[PDB]
């Protein structure tokens, strides 16, 4: 079993190829986010009169495969320019091998911070810095460079060529789609939730910069969006940009409530089962994640469901001086990646001295409607109904 | 399927049975600690002249199995006493079903906090509270109750019966060994690392109370230790007590260094590979835990290896942030469960995080760990000499 590689001419004029590798070996993106669905690395080649322009690259463990694939569509000795929109090694790891294969000087183009990172990572010193809005005539065509910082590093930019946007992480998603582009509706619908997962896990801390970036790109006429991961968008690139904006804003789906809890011995479970049944009774559709002694949800899946939730509900055990370690971890990641102005209910056990969840959420945009104590024998089921009814009233 | 259940007479004078169930369904103890090896729940029955004393129980999902097994060695209606050394539901979950099966009042013995927790968990109210050192004559024998608080809850006590200590979590371990007791040396040797894993994960926050508890029990002649999880110790209970104390004190195994790192892209891995080679060249035997894009260690296994390490070495990815999620979780759990005065080396990438973010070093600095140096993880121009300097500094500190 070898990774699937796509090499296809995607435009006739300008003459543009994609080189895409489907990474089905990776398990944890950035060594953290669970992606059993995989991720692609997409690089591009523009073949012109007097220039051949490589745009981005592949992860470094696939450097040999990249050189071999590239060599089927151009002599590497004839590459003249390499554009690096973002220097993170999932997109730049093949660059040292590429430069060695080319075997002579080439013009490397990056943002100001990108130049600093290429020096730090790889010792590459001969880098041309492009400034915001700068245009460069290469091979008879106008390339325009637009800085879109903090999507998700300070080095990030997008390259515009006659309406075609090479955007690297901007517009990426997880998943290995069965086609290259947005030409099939069923594929698009299956893909978009993996775009949401990518946005929150990779970009979520910087989600306000998605809004700034989309506003900046709105001044360009975009015919196609060619990102570094996932589908290419030739039919309807605005649909992808709209989805990015919707996730960044946290636009909710009516009725959706995400319920996250730990249960050690069934006490939290007993309360949360009743809360979930009450949600359904009242017309909501819960999405449930339970940390138990047999089950351990993926944090990337929890995070994916936050942006379009109308509300969140947490069930928390106290543990030593604080709260259950996996609920601590989950809350810290939600705060870091998915800090939205949404209502929350907390159900909690009292500890030896359960203010922790509120302290964690204090400096966030979430608003806790109520805290309800999880008791054992003498639990008052009416207080569960009270809390769900309060949430329903808040969302009317 | 049905778990393995053991029911065996383990003493004749007095007549004592163990009822042990091997939980091969559980995956995460306390819904957090990875235990592919499983854990047993051990309860005991003491049959005396005029009394039948049940000591502890099984987790609640096995309550039906517990009643059926108990009924093979005694008519439950003839039970007169239940001793609850600790109320956590892995040991007490079968109690409500047991009381219903008995069908009449029994004397339930617990600590003061134990009584409070039995009411809160189960609504059980008629509980006899025993104080520290209290003795009670039951069935012609003296039962002595010794409070051992915070091992690992405020309710914890141990029951001493003429040299036999029923200790519940105190002296427990993970693993489902192929025999009941400590009579096979190869089993004991394979078992003890799973005892260390149990100590750190369950009791580690309160390891100072292990030392206090051991001191308290040292005035008693202990001929056997019968815990709530794992092996029973009839041949050499002092070996187990010494192990608990050694783990609590963090007695190191010479040459052992534990190396823990996250490599987001491979730059940390390149430096840590060189650090590991240098450790080996200087005579150390590293144990290595790597978070990468393809592999993820169990946090319970990291924690198990801390107590007998001479030192820890951390490799920390930063870039946009000072501490990433898995190394944050790991560091916070080491601080919570395995907070020892041991030397540490930190290797870390120089990132661009906002200055107000806590660094990995600043966090470790709060603790008993002693950071000997910080070494920058660089890319192409990394100076191997700086790696060797750090390992040499560690060797100087450790001898
Ligand atoms: Cl619980
Ligand atoms: Cl954490
Ligand atoms: Cl790295």
3-state secondary structure chain B: CCCCEEEEEEECCCEEEEEEEEECCCCEECCCEECCCCEEEEEEEEEECCEEEEECCCCHHHHHHHHHHHHCCCCHHHCCEEECCCCCHHHHCCHHHHHHHHCCCCEEEECHHHHHHHHHHHCCCCEEECCCCCEEEECCEEEEEEECCCCCCCCCEEEEECCEEEEECCCCCCCCCCCCECCCHHHHHHHHHHHHHHHHHHHHHHHHHHHHHHHHHCCCCCCEEEECCCCEECCCHHHHHHHHHHHHHCCCCCCEEEEEEECCCCHHHHHHHHHHHHHHHCCCEEEEEEECCCCCCCHHHHHHHCCCCCEEEEEECCCCCCCCHHHHHHHHHHHHHCCCCCEEEEEEECCCCCCCCCCHHHHHHCCCCEEEEEEEECCCCCCHHHHHHHHHHHHHHHC
Which chain A residues are closer than 8 Å to B291 by Cβ? 28, 31-32
Count of CB pairs separated by less than 8 Å, A with B: 117
What torsion, rounded to 10 degrees, do the Cα atoms B281, B331, B40, B112 define? 140
Is B324 in Cβ contact with A293 (below 8 Å)?
no
How many CB atoms within 10 Å of residue B368? 12
Find the B333 Cα to ligand 2 centroid distance in Å. 8
Subunit contact A329:B325, Cβ cutoff 8 A? yes
Closest CA–CA distance from residue A171 to any residue of chain B (Å): 20
Report the chain B residue with the minimal C-alpha distance to residue A291. Answer: B31
* Helix/strand/coil (H/E/C) assignment for every residue in chain A: CCCCEEEEEEECCCEEEEEEEEECCCCEECCCEECCCCEEEEEEEEEECCEEEEECCCCHHHHHHHHHHHHCCCCHHHCCEEECCCCCHHHHCCHHHHHHHHCCCCEEEECHHHHHHHHHHHCCCCEEECCCCCEEEECCEEEEEEECCCCCCCCCEEEEECCEEEEECCCCCCCCCCCCECCCHHHHHHHHHHHHHHHHHHHHHHHHHHHHHHHHHCCCCCCEEEECCCCEECCCHHHHHHHHHHHHHCCCCCCEEEEEEECCCCHHHHHHHHHHHHHHHCCCEEEEEEECCCCCCCHHHHHHHCCCCCEEEEEECEECCEECHHHHHHHHHHHHHCCCCCEEEEEECCCCCCCHHHHHHCCCCCEEEEEEECCCCCCCHHHHHHHHHHHHHHHC
Burial B296-316 (b: 16+ CB within 10 A, else e): bbebbbbbbbbbbbbbbbbbb
Q: Residue B201 phi/psi, 5° resolution? A: -70, -40
CB within 8 Å of chain A, chain B residues 106-145 = 119-123
* Sign of the alpha-carbon torsion through B60, B62, B67, B72: negative
Neighbouring C-alpha atoms within 13 Å toward the C-beta of A373: 9
- Residue A22 near residue A161 (C-beta atoms within 8 A): no
**Residues B221, B163 contacting (CB under 8 angstroms):** yes
Q: Copy the structure tokens of residue B144.
A: 């002595």
Indicate the burial class of A288 (C-beta count within 10 angstroms; 0-12, 13-18, 19 or more).
middle
Is B293 within 8 Å of A266 when comparing Cβ atoms? no
Closest of A246, A125, A153 to residue A193, by C-alpha: A246
User: What domains appear along chain A, each with residue ranges and CATH number?
Assistant: 1-250 (3.60.15.10), 251-396 (3.40.50.360)
B239 sits in the region (left: phi over 0; alpha: psi -120 to 50; else beta) called alpha
Looking up tokens 């639990």 gives A379
Q: Determine how β-strand B164-168 pairs with β-strand B256-262.
A: unpaired
User: Taking a C-beta distance cutoff of 8 angstroms, is the pair B377, B268 a contact?
Assistant: yes
Q: B128 pairs with which residues across the strands?
A: B109
Residue with tokens 């517009």: A171
Q: Tell me the C-alpha to C-alpha distance, in Å, between residue B174 and each of B114, B177, B201, B300.
A: 24, 9, 10, 11
CA of B232 from ligand 1 middle (Å) equals 28
B108's CB contacts (< 8 A; 6+ apart) are: B81, B82, B84, B118, B124, B126, B127, B128
Separation between Cα atoms, residue B265 and residue A327, nearest integer Å: 27
Cis peptide before B31 (omega within 30 of 0): no
DSSP lists the bridge partners of residue A11 as A16
Q: Beta-carbon neighbour count of residue B177 at 10 Å?
A: 19
CB within 8 Å of B81: residues ≥ 6 apart: B51, B52, B53, B54, B106, B107, B108, B109, B138
Residue B292 contacts A where some CB pair is shorter than 8 Å? yes
Tokens of A289: 């994640």
Q: Is the dihedral of CA A21, A27, A29, A31 positive or negative?
A: negative
Q: Report how far apart, in Å, the C-alpha atoms of B229 and of each of A227, A266, B18, B121, B226 are.
A: 54, 20, 11, 21, 9
Resolution (A): 1.4
Distance CA B83, CA B130 (A): 10
Q: How far apart are CA A254 and CA A392, in angstroms?
A: 11
The residues that bridge with B107 in the sheet, in sequence order, are B81
Tell me, in angstroms, the distance from the centre of ligand 3 to residue B323's CA. Answer: 12
Those of residues 375-394 in A touching chain B at CB distance below 8 A are 375-378
CB contact under 8 A, B263 and A378: no
Min Cα distance A292 → chain B (Å) is 5
CA distance B60 to B375: 50
* Bridge partner list, B344: B312, B371
Residue A88, min C-alpha distance to chain B (Å) = 8
Ligand 2 centroid, distance to B332 Cα (angstroms)? 7
Indicate if the alpha-carbon torsion angle B193, B197, B199, B204 is positive or negative.
Answer: positive
Which residues, in sequence order, are CB contacts of B255 under 8 Å at separation 6+?
A: B283, B284, B285, B310
Rounded CA-CA distance B223/B225 in Å is 7
| All residues with CB under 5 Å from ion ligand 3 | B 263-265, 267-268
Let me know: does A297 contact A267? Beta carbons within 8 Å: no
Interface of A with B in 230-269 (CB under 8 A): 262-267
CA of residue B165 relative to chain centroid, distance:
18
Question: CB distance A377–B119 less than 8 Å?
Answer: yes
Q: B-contacting residues of A 314-373, CB under 8 Å? A: 319-320, 324-326, 328-329, 332-333, 352
Nearest to A276 by CA among A373, A368, A370, A388: A388
Yes or no, beta carbons of A324 and B89 under 8 Å apart: no
Q: Which residue of A has its CA nearest to B34?
A: A293
d(CA A257, CA A247): 16
C-alpha B94 – ligand 1 centre gap (Å):
15
Whether residues A376 and B292 touch (CB distance < 8 A) is answered with: no
Give the burial class of A94: count Cβ atoms within 10 A of its Cβ; 0-12 exposed, 13-18 middle, 19 or more buried.
buried
Q: How far is CA A102 from the centre of its chain?
A: 32
Question: What number of CA atoms fall less than 13 Å from residue A134's CA on the CB side?
Answer: 13
CA dist A284 → A258, A315, A388, B22, B181 (Å): 10, 18, 10, 41, 54
The residue assigned the tokens 């041309």 is A128
Way it was determined = X-ray
Closest-approaching ligand to the CA atom of A291? 1
Q: Most B CBs within 10 Å: which of A293, A297, A303, A376, as the mutation test of the B interface? A: A293
CB pairs under 8 A, 24+ apart, for B353-357? Answer: B353/B318, B353/B319, B353/B320, B353/B321, B353/B322, B357/B321, B357/B322, B357/B323
Nearest to A376 among B59, B122, B262 (CB): B122
Residue B139: both structure tokens together: 């069935």
Cα gap B243→B194, rounded to integer Å: 12
Ligand 2 centre distance from Cα of residue A332 (Å): 7
């Amino acid at each position: 079993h070898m990774p699937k590689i796509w090499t296809e001419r995607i435009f006739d004029d300008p003459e543009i190829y994609v080189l895409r590798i489907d990474d089905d070996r990776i398990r944890y993106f950035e060594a953290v986010w669970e992606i059993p669905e995989g991720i692609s690395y997409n690089a591009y080649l523009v073949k012109l009169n007097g220039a051949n322009v490589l745009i981005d690259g592949w992860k470094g463990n696939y450097a040999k495969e990249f050189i071999d694939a590239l060599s089927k569509i151009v002599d590497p000795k004839e590459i003249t320019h390499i554009i690096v929109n973002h220097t993170e090694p999932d997109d730049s790891g093949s660059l040292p091998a590429t430069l060695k294969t080319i075997g002579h000087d080439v013009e490397i183009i990056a943002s100001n911070f990108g130049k600093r990172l290429l020096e730090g990572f790889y010792g590459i010193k001969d880098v041309t810095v492009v400034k915001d809005g700068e245009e460069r005539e290469i091979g008879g065509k106008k390339f325009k460079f637009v800085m879109t910082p903090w999507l998700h590093w300070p080095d990030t930019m997008v390259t515009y060529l006659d309406g075609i946007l090479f955007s690297c992480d901007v517009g990426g998603g997880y998943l290995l789609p069965e086609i290259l582009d947005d030409s099939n509706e069923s594929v698009v619908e299956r893909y978009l939730p993996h775009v949401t997962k990518y946005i929150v896990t990779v970009i979520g801390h910087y989600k306000n910069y998605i809004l700034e970036g989309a506003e900046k790109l709105s001044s360009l006429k975009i015919k196609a969006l060619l990102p570094g991961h996932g589908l290419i968008w030739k039919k309807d690139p605005q649909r992808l940009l709209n989805h990015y904006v919707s996730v960044a804003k946290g636009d909710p789906k009516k009725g959706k409530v995400t319920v996250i809890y730990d249960s050690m011995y069934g006490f939290v479970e007993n309360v949360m089962k009743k809360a979930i049944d009450s949600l359904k009774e009242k017309g909501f559709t819960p999405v449930v994640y339970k940390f138990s002694d047999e089950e351990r949800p993926a944090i990337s899946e929890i995070l994916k469901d936050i942006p379009d939730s109308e509300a969140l509900i947490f069930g928390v055990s106290t543990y030593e001086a604080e709260i259950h370690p996996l609920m601590r971890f989950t809350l810290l990641e939600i705060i870091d990646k998915a800090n939205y102005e949404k209502p929350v209910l907390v159900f909690g056990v009292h500890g030896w001295a359960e203010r922790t969840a509120g302290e964690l959420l204090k400096e966030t945009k979430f608003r806790i409607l109520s805290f309800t104590e999880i008791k054992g024998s003498n639990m008052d089921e009416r207080k569960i109904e009270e809390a769900i009814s309060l949430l329903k009233k808040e969302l009317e």
